[PDB]
């Protein structure tokens, strides 16, 4: 099932990919205690629309969002989250960076490895080291072996590294290796931008870094 406006695409019973317009991705987790987003959207305008679409469709509130990095493209809806009482989880580094850059601050509650449970839905967040940004994290759904790569992970259609101004192009390969070492059996990988793939996208990203 794929539902448009913003587009949402069902991966399984409780997991959806959200995509907003170039295009960027995150997840919607339909849990027994509310909806959880892995990343919100580009700005407040799209973040409000995302929230409104999912709350109406799933008939539950968005309770939590996990922010995968501090750059404008992922932090940009933070005002909307905070004023609605939506918990914005992040690492301390992501929160520091957000503040530095003039954004409202997410919680800074995520450690190198954090294990969250939302109703029945298990989520692990992992900081694998620097890459696309200094602070980039990945998000793992161990019940589904689904990895949200964020901007650490490039889609097949990405044929170059894109913008490397805030990137750490040496450490990025080690970071990707750390994800491959931690998650040896992956069913799907959601890149930051582009089509859903598998562990092949991690290998693709390694190649782009050579």
Swiss-Prot record:
Inhibited by captopril stereoisomers and iodoacetate. Also inhibited by chelating agents such as EDTA. The keyword Metal-binding applies. One of its GO terms (biological process) is response to antibiotic. Its EC number is 3.5.2.6. It catalyses: a beta-lactam + H2O = a substituted beta-amino acid. It is found in: Periplasm. The keyword Ligase does not apply. Keywords: Antibiotic resistance, Hydrolase, Metal-binding, Periplasm, Signal, Zinc. Its main location: periplasm. GO terms for cellular component: periplasmic space. Zn(2+) 1 binds at residues 69, 71, 132. Zn(2+) 2 binds at residues 73, 151, 193. GO terms for molecular function: beta-lactamase activity; zinc ion binding. Binds 2 Zn(2+) ions per subunit. The enzyme can also function with only 1 Zn(2+) ion. It holds the Pfam family Lactamase_B. Substrate binds at residues 154, 163. Its cofactor is Zn(2+). Belongs to the metallo-beta-lactamase superfamily. Class-B beta-lactamase family. NCBIfam families: bla_Bc_2, bla_class_B_core, bla_subclass_B1. Monomer. Confers resistance to the different beta-lactams antibiotics (penicillin, cephalosporin and carbapenem) via the hydrolysis of the beta-lactam ring. Active on cephalosporin and penicillin. This is Metallo-beta-lactamase type 2. It comes from Bacillus cereus. The lineage of its organism: Bacteria, Bacillati, Bacillota, Bacilli, Bacillales.
